[PDB]
Amino acid sequence: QVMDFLFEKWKLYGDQCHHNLSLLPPPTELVCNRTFDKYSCWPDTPANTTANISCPWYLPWHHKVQHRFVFKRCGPDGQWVRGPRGQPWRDASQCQMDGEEIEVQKEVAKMYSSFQVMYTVGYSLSLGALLLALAILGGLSKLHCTRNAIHANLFASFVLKASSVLVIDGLLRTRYSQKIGDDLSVSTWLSDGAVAGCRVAAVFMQYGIVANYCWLLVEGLYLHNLLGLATLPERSFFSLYLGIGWGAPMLFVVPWAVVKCLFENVQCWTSNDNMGFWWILRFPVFLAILINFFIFVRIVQLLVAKLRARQMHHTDYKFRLAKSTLTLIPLLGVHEVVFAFVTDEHAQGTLRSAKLFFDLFLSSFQGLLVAVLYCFLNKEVQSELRRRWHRWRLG
């Protein structure tokens, strides 16, 4: 957000210097000549003398160092001091990073990194489990079931989300890793030549991480609608479900992408500006977490009602069974404590860090948990698989 601003400010300072510094009459005294090391333009000072020039105004943190200066001295020969191979020294230590920002930036970096490793691991394992789960679903005799047809789509959505997040993270890394050797080098990097790929990756990531929530909501609706009706459904309405799962995010993603391309065109669309402008993308998430949590509390009520009717032989055993299963379902209505009230706005510090940690961890491991709970511990799929392996054993 500030790289473009800093670039433009530096160019403005430089050309303003070439303008004003040009109109510098040559004094007849022994004054070290016009020197400008692409850092700051200063009036020429007599040899053996130091100039206390106001430090450059293009610095990102200049707005807090108004009362700071830089002392640069040129010696008797009209030349400045030379470093290891002629590098001049500029006394900019007072207009540079203060002693307190460097370390804090170090902790912030460490935290960001830790979070990255944590969710990259989770995504990796979720993808590994989901690929096997999808293969099992689409390569066996259980595939001809409407319920499994929705689990397959949910797994595909999870895989797409994980892969897109991983690709966008890699693209950002790569873009913010190459060194800056020249002014032209930063120009091309700040240009739109490499921006198209990052923009496409960001759009894909948003679409995937919205379609994941939409399929969670779809599955919740299917489960809720499959319990209210007495008899089995006449038709599967799969056409409706695919449309509200893979197609509803579209009407919420394309408007965001177009509006960003029009008004908020930052170097890459990963940066979220105009807080009162990003809601167009979080609206489906909030909608897809309240109307699937209301059904959650309704499915739990039905499950408890079906438990305190019979099966009284296992006295006090209702709690144990009303739990394992009560946990087999948060695969959706998860991350509700830190999502209903604490939002991106008016949430910072330890609370914001904890919110990011929580959800992220939960979202990264949700795919793996769902795959394990619905393609590896499912009695039916286990049995069908054991029977198949036993049959193949004789061969």
Partner: peptide, 29 residues
């Protein structure tokens, strides 16, 4: 939807880090 906010924070961090690096490359070079 905390993935988007985390990515937006990371992007801002990275941009800041590199601004300091531009400044640094410019301090000597």
């Amino acid at each position: 939807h905390s993935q988007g906010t985390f990515t937006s924070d990371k992007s801002e961090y990275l941009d800041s880090e590199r601004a300091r690096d531009f400044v640094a490359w410019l301090e000597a070079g």
